[PDB]
Structure formats: C-alpha cells, structure tokens
Amino acid sequence: GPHMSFNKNGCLVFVSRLWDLDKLGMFHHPVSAEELPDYHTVIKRPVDLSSIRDGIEKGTYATDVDVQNDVARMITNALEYNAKGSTWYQEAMSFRKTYLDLARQSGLVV
Ligand SMILES: COc1cc2c(cc1-c1c(C)noc1C)ncc1[nH]c(=O)n([C@H](C)c3ccccn3)c12
Ligand SMILES: [Cl-]
Ligand SMILES: [K+]
C-alpha cells in the first residue's frame, strides 16, 4: 500500500456520502450567476461537491484533511448564504454536525 495522507478513493467515498445525503441537491453544483445572481456577492469563496470531486480526481488536494477543510468551508458558506431555520440551513446544520463522522466512515483520518 501507499501508506499516505491522501487517499483518493476514500475522499470520493466521502463526497459520495455527502452527495447522497444532500437531498436538496444544494451542494451538488456550482451556482450559476444567471440563476441566482446574489450568491456570488455574499459568498466570495464558493465550493461545491462537483468541484471537490474534480479536484480529488485531478489530485489537486494535497491530503485528505484538505478535502475535509473544503467540505467544512462548503457547509459554512451554506450557513452564511441561507437564513437560520430555512430548509437549506437545516440541512447544512445537519452536515456541520456529521461531516467528520462521514469522513471517518469513508476511511479518512480526521
Ligand atoms: C439552483 O437554483 C437555486 C438554488 C437556490 C435557490 C434558488 C434556486 C433557483 C431555482 C431552482 N430556480 O430559480 C432559482 C433562483 N434559493 C436558495 C438557495 N440556497 C441554496 O443553498 N441554494 C443552492 C445553490 C441550491 C442548489 C440546488 C438546489 C437547491 N438549492 C439555493
Ligand atoms: Cl439569518
Ligand atoms: K445566514
């Protein structure tokens, strides 16, 4: 085995769990400026699961912790953009509380 701090398939398993648990699909794709024009004025450092998947497959995440950090940013961004108590915010809060366990479930070191 490679015995290393980047585990590509483990990171993809992590993203697959996040994807599947994202019932609103609110994390699935980058936000189009034409569809939701205010988003980019509120969220200046966007990230989404498709972009994270692209990065994992390309190798442009150094380590599994870097993937975890981008998922944390993804969640924080959704908590910023959406209003407390909204369905979106509820889902993002659920992710905040569980994403590290999802990483562990996937085989990553947290
Ligand atoms: C991707 O489309 C949206 C995403 C929204 C949204 C409204 C739209 C939307 C839709 C759908 N049709 O017109 C508009 C405007 N309003 C709030 C909100 N909060 C939020 O996190 N999103 C994300 C990006 C999203 C993506 C896909 C499905 C559901 N939600 C959204
Ligand atoms: Cl609010
Ligand atoms: K908010």
Residue numbers in the entry: 5 to 114
From the paper:
Trypanosoma brucei is a unicellular, protozoan parasite and the causative agent of Human African Trypanosomiasis (sleeping sickness). Here, we report that acetyl-lysine (AcK) recognizing bromodomain proteins maintain the BF cell fate in trypanosomes. Consistent with its more widespread genomic localization, knockdown of Bdf3 increased transcription for more of the VSGs in the genome than was the case for Bdf2. These results imply that while both proteins maintain monoallelic expression of VSG genes, Bdf2 has a more specialized role in maintaining silencing at ESs.
To provide a blueprint towards designing high-affinity trypanosome-specific bromodomain inhibitors, we determined the crystal structure of the Bdf2 bromodomain in complex with I-BET151 at 1.25Å resolution. The overall structure adopts the canonical bromodomain fold comprising four α-helices linked by variable loop regions that form the ligand binding site.
